Design a protein around this ligand. Structure first.
Ligand SMILES: [Li+]
Length: 99
């Protein structure tokens, strides 16, 4: 069933590549993978339900991966509403910018 909140991961605990990603989003790129910036549909309902176009996804590079890999940042529309998945969207944690 439904749950009241997504869990959290401290900004300081993210891998450094995720910090790089957040910076690339701020700077508008350049993005390493062609699917960077696409709309994320949130089809499994792991993140709060919103209309199509609320969320976008961006690669977080996995060191030594010859392919895109499993890590991503998903951005929401609200201030500081960034989510991290390290497992191809099987789970997310909301980035806590205060720690
Ligand atoms: Li951002």
């Amino acid at each position: 069933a439904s749950v009241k909140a997504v869990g959290r991961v401290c900004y300081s605990a993210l891998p450094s590549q995720a910090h790089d990603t957040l910076d690339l989003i701020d700077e508008g790129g350049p993005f390493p993978y062609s699917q960077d910036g696409v709309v994320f549909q949130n089809r499994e309902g792991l993140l709060p339900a919103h209309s199509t176009g609320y969320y976008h996804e961006y690669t977080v590079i996995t060191p030594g991966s010859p392919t895109r890999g499993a890590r991503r940042i998903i951005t929401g529309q609200q201030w500081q509403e960034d989510y991290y998945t390290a497992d191809h969207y099987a789970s997310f944690r909301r980035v806590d910018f205060a720690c």
